């Protein structure tokens, strides 16, 4: 009698959890929706200590000696991954100040100073050169829309920040198509600490 009741409880909760994991796994990306992305982030924050605590429980109550050793290795695995994420995320945040540094999807950030403010966008592919194009006063860099900027006021330098190094790229070539239209190329010249 009581045997069947618990079966129902466990299966109901697991079914809800499985659906949640399916949703965040299918739709949890910024290029799809930021809403499901934040849900996926909450899941990952919860997931690290749960895996470690679960493996610790299995290490205290093992099936045999081999289960004990594997449980210990898996628990240390959870710990090492959390430590690694925190280290690289904090380093990128100290370097840029953007919340994009907490995104496991991107480890390259492009910082462009528009006037007196800075706009940061994750970089898809690392490269030594960055192309900027302005059309009728609207600026798009590296194939990504960055906003409204006059071609005459383009920055001389632009930075690319990774967890370990910060790179500076200076303008080299400048071509003016129209009054407020043109193309410019930035190439790297120095590495940071």
């Amino acid at each position: 009698d009581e045997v069947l009741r618990l079966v129902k409880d466990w299966n109901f909760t697991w079914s809800v959890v499985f659906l949640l994991i399916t949703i965040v796994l299918q739709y949890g990306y910024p290029s799809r929706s930021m809403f499901v992305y934040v849900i996926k982030m909450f899941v990952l924050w919860l997931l690290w200590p749960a895996s470690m605590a679960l493996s610790i429980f299995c290490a205290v109550y093992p099936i045999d000696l081999a289960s004990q050793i594997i449980s210990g290795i898996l628990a240390a695995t959870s710990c090492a991954m959390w430590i690694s994420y925190f280290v690289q995320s904090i380093r990128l945040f100290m370097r840029t100040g953007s919340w994009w540094s907490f995104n496991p999807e991107s480890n390259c950030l492009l910082n462009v100073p528009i006037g007196g403010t800075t706009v940061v966008r994750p970089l898809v592919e690392d490269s030594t050169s960055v192309t900027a194009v302005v059309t009728d006063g609207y600026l798009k860099m590296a194939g990504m829309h960055f906003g409204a900027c006059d071609f005459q006021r383009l920055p001389s330098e632009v930075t690319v920040a990774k967890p370990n190094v910060l790179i500076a790229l200076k303008m080299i070539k400048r071509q003016a198509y129209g009054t407020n239209s043109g193309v410019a190329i930035y190439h790297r010249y120095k590495a940071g600490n």
Partner: peptide, 4 residues
Amino acid sequence: AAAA
């Protein structure tokens, strides 16, 4: 200061 920093917009993303």
